[PDB]
């Protein structure tokens, strides 16, 4: 059962109290491009699920249980301290993610936190290639109808050579162990969910645009209005995802600029998008919330606009949530 009292297993983290909601930067940070990488070691999903046996998370805070549902979460933040790859804001993104989920009362049964920041309360382990792979398997391995899964990554996205380039993420030990290709992330995180499981995945990568091979997407570009009726669009033939996967990322505005012939930051946009969506206390639809969120990113000088991708065409009139299955937009084949 979920721990419902602070006297049950002792005191738990108060991330809001450590200033992680209100007293850390929510501004853009600099993300230098990593550059083209050598070929990665492709994932053996068998070995991943084997290495995940016996892994577990911990309950990060007390909250009100959702009847008929469990919640599992994996957070990955990578600053690449001391290297040419160093990023200032990725572990801070995870701080804000954790504090926002706590503030809003998401009842997480088990969380795993992979960050390279020292003295980070609740840190499970280092975000190495092998840890990311096995804990991705951990997140999805026990999934049953009604379950809710949450995934957050803030770190480098880049390209790696094949054995045409692949999009990939860089673990903290990428220099030794190589990157993880988006196809393998899709196979670990998305492909192995059964029906009636809900996942939300947030990828905060300054230089990717990748949508993890999902079949439907919606970009909340500059010409969208609250008085319009947005829809997702199909961008890939075929689909191997049974569950309800929703992904938040940032991408370039698809509206063509009126500039003919200001300052921004590329880091932190996806995290601000999801946290802004969660902090809005008015039970807005996906569509309306993405407008407000787009406006926040342009106000705060982020380079990116919001991108929502999914395993089904979500009716954007549906109320945004982390916990509910999608209402399908039947107009999108
Ligand atoms: Cl619950
Ligand atoms: Cl609709
Ligand atoms: Na915040
Ligand atoms: Na990068
Ligand atoms: Na598959
Ligand atoms: Na700003």
Swiss-Prot record:
Residues of the active site: 156, 206
Record: residues binding Ca(2+): 166, 182-183, 213
Site label Cleavage, positions: 53-54, 261
EC number, UniProt record: 3.4.22.-
Single GO term (MF): cysteine-type endopeptidase activity
Thermal dependence, as annotated: Optimum temperature is 20-25 degrees Celsius.
Protein source organism: Trypanosoma brucei brucei (strain 927/4 GUTat10.1)
Site residues, Important for Arg/Lys-specific substrate specificity: 93, 204
Record region (Regulates substrate access to the active site): 1-68
Protein name per its UniProtKB record: Metacaspase-2
């Amino acid at each position: 059962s979920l721990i419902t009292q602070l006297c049950d297993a002792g005191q738990l983290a108060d991330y809001v109290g450590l200033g992680w909601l209100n007293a850390v930067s929510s501004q853009p940070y600099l993300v230098q491009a990593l550059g083209l990488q050598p070929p990665p070691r492709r994932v053996d999903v068998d070995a991943a699920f084997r290495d995940a046996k016996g892994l577990h998370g911990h309950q990060p805070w007390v909250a009100t249980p959702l009847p008929g549902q469990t919640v599992r979460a994996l957070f990955i933040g990578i600053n690449y301290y001391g290297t040419s790859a160093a990023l200032s804001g990725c572990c801070n993104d995870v701080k804000q993610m954790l504090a926002t989920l706590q503030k809003r009362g998401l009842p997480i049964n088990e969380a795993v936190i992979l960050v390279d920041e020292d003295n980070f309360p609740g840190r499970t382990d280092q975000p190495t290639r092998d840890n990311i792979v096995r804990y991705m398997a951990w997140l999805v391995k026990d999934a049953k109808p009604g379950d809710v899964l949450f995934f957050h990554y803030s770190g480098h996205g880049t390209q790696c050579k094949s054995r045409k380039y692949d999009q990939c993420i860089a673990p903290v030990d990428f220099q030794k162990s190589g990157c993880i290709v988006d196809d393998d992330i899709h196979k670990l995180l998305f492909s192995r969910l059964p029906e009636k499981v809900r996942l939300t995945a947030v990828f905060d990568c300054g230089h990717s645009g990748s949508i993890m091979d999902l079949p439907f997407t919606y970009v909340c570009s500059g010409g969208e209005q609250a008085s319009g009726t947005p829809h997702m669009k199909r961008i890939r033939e075929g689909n191997d995802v049974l569950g309800d996967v929703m992904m938040i990322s940032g991408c370039a505005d698809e509206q063509t600029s009126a500039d003919v012939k200001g300052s921004t930051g590329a880091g932190g946009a996806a995290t601000q998008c999801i946290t802004c969506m969660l902090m809005n206390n008015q039970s807005l639809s996906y569509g309306k919330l993405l407008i407000e969120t787009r406006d926040m990113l342009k106000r705060k000088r982020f380079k990116q606009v919001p991108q929502l991708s999914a395993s089904k065409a979500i009716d954007l009139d549906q109320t945004f949530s982390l916990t509910e299955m999608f209402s399908v937009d039947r107009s999108i084949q």
